[model samples]
Target: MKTYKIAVDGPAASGKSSTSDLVARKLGFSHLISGNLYRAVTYGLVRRFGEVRPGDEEQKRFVLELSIEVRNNRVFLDGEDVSESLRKEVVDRHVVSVAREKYIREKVFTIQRSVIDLEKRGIVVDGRDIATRIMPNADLKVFLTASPETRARRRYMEGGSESYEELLESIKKRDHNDRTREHDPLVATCDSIVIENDSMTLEETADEIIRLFRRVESFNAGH
Candidate 1:
């Protein structure tokens, strides 16, 4: 079977990560969380210097030093399992800023492209700019999202430290940042299907995406 590249893009707390993971698992595909690339980079920089400013000489050198790898759907940085740390509030607060950096985006895009090249089991990558920038030639592109209130509530229910109000404000701000960033802003391409799964369970969302993939596969086979 030919390997397929699936790109799922959306705003903060939009369930792209969980949905993509389930879809990948059902299809026996490799899953990649592109946001984690930003988070991992943010974690490394914050740990080293306590602050990150785009284009700083030392920061650029440090970005080059950190190695990234995907093992069992988890992102490994410099041989250490930083997946848990990547989700920390500190990394969450700084990822948007760090991700806006030209050098970081360029480096991360290089890594994102390489992951697909190395995987023969197909891939399901979820991130803001996956379809627009990272995998422009993706076999299937999906923009999965939900309303802001719904998205915030979903994150709040995940047992995070922040209050619901705080999560709401944070998600709103994150959505704004992701959509208005100067480079590779989150967007739904014309060819991509937009699934607004505000009321769908994760399993349902994954099933919908799987159905979409099967249709595309069958159509390709016929032609």
Candidate 2:
């Protein structure tokens, strides 16, 4: 009864969350969206302090004291429901900044790993650095990716009002910030299965991942 841990890593709007959720459902594994924790930190900073200003001591203090919980597949920030708030534009604009901070990244990594460690059933964890930094030895490491145009298009179509140019610029900025940050930067690992999902439907992508997982499981069982 060996439990499998699947790590899904990718940039924003690359379908990491959607694909991870689908894979978890198909595999009967619990799903954990680690980015939601970082978003919760950003949400808590805004709620407790105000619009976050970089290098603001008060905002950093609030972020430092934040605690997160996931119960019944819903994320709670300091015991308050914040699943919907994390998707708002305000949080979306600032979460990458929060994640760029070294201390904040470390804190969130600790919390995320703890959640994975506590899962008795299998788990699928999705975030920017999961495969490279957080869960390097996961049974399955998937890096979902797409071209910048496709990524921006997906974002704009998903209730984001930004124009294609705006989305592209924002995506580039976010990618630069995430990749060049002092903390854990987003990177694809050598051993990971990179899925460039520019043209596939969600179900098609999920089926591909499930097919890979089944093959891996069969190989492991034989060995």
Candidate 3:
């Protein structure tokens, strides 16, 4: 039997990461954050002026030659630990542009697949396009969402250190960029189970998803 998989997708500050982690822990499955892979790319690019847009010959070379690793729930770039750097504001600002680059996306997608292939029991992955792009055949696909104001408030509460208004605007801008991007646009798949958590507490939301996770596991087991 194949490992059971779950794809949790949502826009910025939508609570997918924590919720997915909770679900993963409950199911004893490995957890992967796909967006971190992009931020990992940006963290490397900005450190030494490696940042470049798509279609540039240098950007193509940079991505093709780049290496990323997700080991024991940690992210690495070029054989170095970059998990902390991925959360820096500079990496946040740079990841959106790099994510849309075809070469970069292809490379990171492969990294995710490598990690997924190693997990025997199951894995839960959260990202903008994991369900629609990276793991289209996942056993369970969940799309999480919240109002922009709600999302910004959640991010602010989590130590953004930025003004609520600024965070709100930045999230809105990212939504536009993700939705408008030509490659792997961030849209919930048609068959996804959508969870709008504007009013739901984090525990409440995670409980709901955990039930769904069990439901899928039972379904997979029975099949």
Candidate 4:
């Protein structure tokens, strides 16, 4: 049996991580959250620079020097365990800024591609630009989406203390920033399967993806 690569992409709070994790578990594939890599780097930058101001050359330099690795589902930064640090609210607030930087994106893109290259067998990666930019030719590409309100609610439910309205506003702003960014703006590719997961449970969504994967595989085999 040939191993396959699956790429899942979406905006914040679209359930990409949960869905990707579940799908990878079911398929027995190694799962990776590429976003967490950026988050890990951002955490290091925050520790060094206090609060990162986007476009600051000094902060950019620090970010460039940071390295990230994922081992056994935990993240390491600069040879130190930082899996817990990566999820800090401070890191989450500023990660999008670093993600928007062209130079940072280029550097991270190279690292991401290299990581995927190392996976000869099954690997599932989920992030904003995975389907469209990172792995355009992935065997399976899923673009997950949901209403901003629904997305905000999900985020709030997932340990966020912000009010629903605040969460919605933040999500909308992030969407705009991601979609309008000069480097690798978020957009669904024509080859991707669009999944509106607003109403579905994570299990349902994973099963749907599995079904799609089987159908696509059969179609390719018959061709």
Instruction: State the C-alpha lDDT per candidate.
Output: 0.89, 0.83, 0.86, 0.84
Q: Weakest 10 consecutive residues, lDDT, candidate 2?
A: 46-55
Q: Write the per-residue lDDT of candidate 3 for residues 1-223, one digit (tens) a residue.
A: 5898899998999999898888888879999988888887788778856554646777667667777788865788778998888889888777888888877888888889988998999999999889998899998899999999999988898885689999999999999999999999999868799999998988888889888878877887889
What order do candidates take by lDDT, descending? 1, 3, 4, 2
By the lDDT metric, which is better: model 2 or model 3?
3
Better of 1 and 4 by lDDT: 1
Evaluate model 1: give its TM-score.
0.95
| Pairs of residues at least 3 apart in sequence or in different chains that clash in candidate 4 | none
| C-alpha RMSD for every candidate | 1.3, 1.7, 1.6, 1.7
lDDT of 4 by residue, 115-169 (tens): 7777767788899888878888788899999999888888888775778888888
Best by TM-score: 1
Model 2 ranges off by over 4 Å: none
Which candidate gets the maximum lDDT versus the true structure?
A: 1
**Model 1 residue 196 lDDT score:** 96
lDDT per residue as tens, model 1, 1-223: 5679999998898899889999999999989888888998999889899987757888899898778886665777889888889888899888989988887898899888888888887999999998898889888899999999999898888896899999999999988988898999988889899999988999999999999999998898899
Deviating ranges (above 4 Å) for candidate 1: none
| Counted clashes in each candidate structure | 0, 0, 0, 0
Against the hidden reference, what TM-scores do the models get?
A: 0.95, 0.93, 0.94, 0.93
